Amino acid sequence: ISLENVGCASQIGKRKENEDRFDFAQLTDEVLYFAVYDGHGGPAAADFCHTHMEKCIMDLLPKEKNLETLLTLAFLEIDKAFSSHARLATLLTSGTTATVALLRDGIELVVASVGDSRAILCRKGKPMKLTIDHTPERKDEKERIKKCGGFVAWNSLGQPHVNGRLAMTRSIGDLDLKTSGVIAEPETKRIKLHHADDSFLVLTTDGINFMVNSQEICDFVNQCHDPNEAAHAVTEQAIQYGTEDNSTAVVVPFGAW
Ligand SMILES: [Mg+2]
Numbered sequence: 001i002s003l004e005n006v007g008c009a010s011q012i013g014k015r016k017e018n019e020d021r022f023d024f025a026q027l028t029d030e031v032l033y034f035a036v037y038d039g040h041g042g043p044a045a046a047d048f049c050h051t052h053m054e055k056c057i058m059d060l061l062p063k064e065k066n067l068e069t070l071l072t073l074a075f076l077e078i079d080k081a082f083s084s085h086a087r088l089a090t091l092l093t094s095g096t097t098a099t100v101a102l103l104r105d106g107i108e109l110v111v112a113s114v115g116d117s118r119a120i121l122c123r124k125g126k127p128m129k130l131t132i133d134h135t136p137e138r139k140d141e142k143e144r145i146k147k148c149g150g151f152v153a154w155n156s157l158g159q160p161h162v163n164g165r166l167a168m169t170r171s172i173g174d175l176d177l178k179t180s181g182v183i184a185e186p187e188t189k190r191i192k193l194h195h196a197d198d199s200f201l202v203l204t205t206d207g208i209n210f211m212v213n214s215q216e217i218c219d220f221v222n223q224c225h226d227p228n229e230a231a232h233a234v235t236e237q238a239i240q241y242g243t244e245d246n247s248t249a250v251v252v253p254f255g256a257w
Contacts (some may be wrong), residue, residue, distance in 0.1 A: 001032060001106050006221055007227030007251035009235040013207055013243055018152075019043045020205050020248040021050035021096075021136075031104050031181040036248055038097040038117050038205040045173030047195075048082045053100065056081075060239025063150030067102050067222070068188040073110035076099075079172050079184035090158035095174030099203055101252075107193045107203070112186035114170035116206060121191065122199040122221065126217070127214040130189045134170040141169035150180030167225060167251045184223055201229065209239045227251035 001028060012018040019039030027033050035053060056074045064070040084112065087210025088091055104110075109117045113131040121128040126136060128148030134141055136152045137160060145162055155165035161167055162182060166174055170183050202221055206208075212220075220237055224230035234249040 001103065001254070003032065005227055005253050006034070007085060007231030008227065009231040009250070010246065011207070011235045011239060011250040012246055015244070015246055017043055019046055020207070020246040022203070022250050023050055023053070023246050024252070027054065028061060031061065031102055033057060033100070034201070034203065034250055035098065035100040036117050036203040036205055036250060037099075038248070040095050041093040041174070042090050042198055044086070044091050044094040045082060045171075048079055049096055049098055049172055050084065052078055052081065053098075055083055057102070066103060066227050067108070067110040068109065068112070068190055071100060071102065071110060071188055072186060075112060075114065075172065075184050075186045075207045078143070083175055083178070083215050086173070091177050095171040097168065097170050097205070101203070103193075107195075108192045109193055112188045114172060114184055114186045115168045116209060117211055118202075118204045118214060118217070120202050120204075120217060122202070122218050124197045125177060125199070125222075128155055128191075129214055129220045131189060132192065134163060134187075136167075138167055138169065140181060144183075145169060146182035147178065148178065148181035150182070155171060156218070160219060165253075192256075193254060197256060198254040199256040200230075200254055201236070201252040202230075203250045204234065205246060205248040207243045207245035208234055208249060210245065211238045211241040211243050221251060227253045227257070
């Protein structure tokens, strides 16, 4: 897996600020990192994650061999550190998704997420979704919101929001909703890559996600010669469909690219 062929694109769109962050790096000889963070309420929370995630992960790697466990601890560590940082005034309502992929030894893929940023494995030409959206229509998420003293309010567009404010049920930051069910504990997915079958991994933010489903995302990517082109093609398509949000994509090529 060569990081020199990863594609990335981040387009601000019709917003005053780009609140998306993305990154990838080689953390150790065995472990590669890829992440998108889709901010809301100001970029503070996404930028924080973008600034602190590598080190938080690298510190944990000699202590935790289980990548799913590691990523869970890391997300909670990062949220704890962010909350100290905001405390010490819009920062109290700054929040972010976080979708983090670790790839160990070129073959063991672990994805941890809170929120609605997607990670899609293209396996044998078909989308395999490696995240599930943390949104208020989800039965388990609904139930935990009520259990912790939050509630769901539906806006005039028929969209559900936690306490009438937040469209997702897990995030980093959103400190005012951390005691009402909006947790930083991620869900994780583990998959063994198969380099004959597996074509790429694509991470996307809501500027894309609101415009296209995950099959359409794979479609855009597959019509492109390289990941770099693919990553721009995905973001530009979202914009052409009239998206108003920041649009960010990371395309990581695998054996079957
Ligand atoms: Mg956003």
